[PDB]
Amino acid sequence: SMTSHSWLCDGRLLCLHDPSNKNNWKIFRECWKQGQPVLVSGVHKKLKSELWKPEAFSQEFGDQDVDLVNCRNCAIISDVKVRDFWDGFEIICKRLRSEDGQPMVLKLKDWPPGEDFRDMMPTRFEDLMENLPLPEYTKRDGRLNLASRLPSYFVRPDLGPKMYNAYGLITAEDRRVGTTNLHLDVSDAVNVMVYVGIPIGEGAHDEEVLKTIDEGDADEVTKERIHDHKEKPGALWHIYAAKDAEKIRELLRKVGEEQGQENPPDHDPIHDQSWYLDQTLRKRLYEEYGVQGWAIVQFLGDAVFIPAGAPHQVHNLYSCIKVAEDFVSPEHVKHCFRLT
């Protein structure tokens, strides 16, 4: 029956159940003070579902010019129509094919571009911003959002939100690649899964999704959300505490060296955004450096709260539309300060 919250990651991750509850801050704020990520479920039930479909984006914006990335090999597909991405989002037989004749796993780069989301999509902007959880933290004008209140001694976030659109990774070989590589942000962020597309053609690809979640180190309760309630899983995240960022840099310098990269001893493999931690590298981080992370499956309507300074990576299971907003909480403002 209905409850305020539950725990994932064996007690280490807060899951809030009611996204608009005026009392959520009472449960949120101690987990957030400790540097933990937080999950909030149910945001899809608050949104106008017609605004967030792949077919509407194609119909309304399809003649815009964009670049795509081939997630398998990082090859850039320059200066194509955005309809060429959207029309293959769920229908595999419409997808652009690589030279080997296979349908590609594509990411749409920087769309809408820079800060243009609000100008290009005013009705979507209103629908998202009015339904974000923890609104004193996440709204542009929230009382606990310092973004508009800080001097130039602090790195300030760009005007958001930002959309993140990409197909699902499909094969056993795809398990070792990221949709978004390991990186960190100096602001806090909330990332909302507004649509999950489960394809058709080569549709029935449900067994390799279970193997990816299992190999991804997902907890036993997370595995129950599929088997028992038939929720749509979108993406597998790994998030690490901000305090563990330098130990992760030491691991990736050592692995770069082993693989014959020629790197100065101070170079920053996290800022480079060139690594995805696969099962092998995650085990090595735990065993050799004593660092544990949070493995998080983001279902349709889940909002993931990512603490400033926390290294994180994203692997899409199915085709995803995500929308994210940056904010600056008082708990984590040290991470954007420009001195010492």
Ligand SMILES: OC[C@H]1CN(c2ccc(Cl)cc2)NN1
């Ligand atoms: O029927 C029992 C109630 C419990 N509930 C709820 C209470 C507090 C928060 Cl913060 C969120 C949800 N709604 N149902």
Ligand SMILES: [Cl-]
């Ligand atoms: Cl709009």
Ligand SMILES: [Cl-]
């Ligand atoms: Cl709040």
Ligand SMILES: [Cl-]
């Ligand atoms: Cl990336």
Ligand SMILES: [Cl-]
């Ligand atoms: Cl911190």
Ligand SMILES: [Mn+2]
């Ligand atoms: Mn990020």
